[model samples]
Target: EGYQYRALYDYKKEREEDIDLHLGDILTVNKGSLVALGFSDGQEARPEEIGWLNGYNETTGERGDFPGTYVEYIGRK
Candidate 1:
C-alpha cells in the first residue's frame, strides 16, 4: 500500500544536501515519510531493500534532514 511519486524539481545539493534526485527519479513510499527511500547508485544488494522503495544509501555523501515538497505523485490514474 504505497504511492509512487516523481521528482518535479532537481533536489540539488544545497547546504542541507538531500537525496540527489533528478527530474525523473522514481521513488516508492509505502510509508508516509519524505526521506530518500533506497538507493542503488552504490553498495551491495540486499533483501531488506525490497518492496516499494528499497536499496542502498549513498555513503560517500550524507544528506541533511529536511522536508521535501518538490516531488509529486505520478503513479496510477
Candidate 2:
C-alpha cells in the first residue's frame, strides 16, 4: 500500500509537472521516483527534490510532484 498525507498549506503549480494543492488536501504517495513520474531526465532525483514527493492529489484527482514539506505524512493505506 502507498503512504498517505494531508496538505498543510495551499500550493499552486508553477510548472506543468507540478501538482496544485490546497490546504487540507489529501494525497496518496505515488511510490515512484521523480524520473519514473516523468518529472526529471536524470538517473536519480535532483538535490532540490529531496523534500519533494510524487503523489496523487485526492482533492483534485491529479497526479504529479508535490513538495513533501507541504504535506504531513498520515500513514500507509
Candidate 3:
C-alpha cells in the first residue's frame, strides 16, 4: 500500500537531531521505498516498511532522517 506523505509544516533546525522539514516535502512509505533508504522512512505504513521518517532533506536538498509524526499523508507519488 502507498502511504506517501507531505510535510504540511515547514521546519528549519540548527541542531542535528532537530526535525528540520519543510512544507511540500514528499516521502514514500512504501515497501520498496523503504529498502532504498535501508528501512529509514518511518510512517504508519506496512509492517515491513516500518521505520522513522528519516531520509531525504527536501528543503536543504540533502539526505537525512527525522520523526515520522512530522508529516501528513497527501497522495502517492
Most accurate candidate by TM-score: 2
How far off is residue 5 in model 3, in Å?
1.6
Error (Å) of candidate 1 at residue 5 is 0.3
Least well predicted 10-residue stretch by lDDT in candidate 3: 42-51
- TM-scores for all predictions: 0.42, 0.73, 0.46
Query: How many steric overlaps are in each model, in order?
Result: 0, 0, 5
Task: Give the per-residue Cα lDDT of candidate 3 at 51.
Answer: 37
CA lDDT of each candidate?
Answer: 0.41, 0.73, 0.57
lDDT of 3 by residue, 3-76 (tens): 56667677675457555677877665445655566655443544324435545554556555555656775556
Q: Model 2 segments beyond 4 Å from truth? A: 32-49
Against the true structure, candidate 3 has what lDDT?
A: 0.57
Summarize candidate 1's per-residue lDDT along 1-77 as a digit string, tens digits: 44445556665554444456567666554333323544443211221233233211233233333224645555521
Clashing pairs in 3: 42-51, 42-52, 54-65, 54-66, 55-65
> Sort by TM-score, best first: what order?
2, 3, 1
RMSD of each: 11.8, 5.6, 5.5
Q: Evaluated with lDDT, which candidate comes out highest?
A: 2
Candidate 3: lDDT of 65? Answer: 55
Candidates arranged by lDDT, highest first: 2, 3, 1
Q: What's the residue-level lDDT of 47 in candidate 1?
A: 17
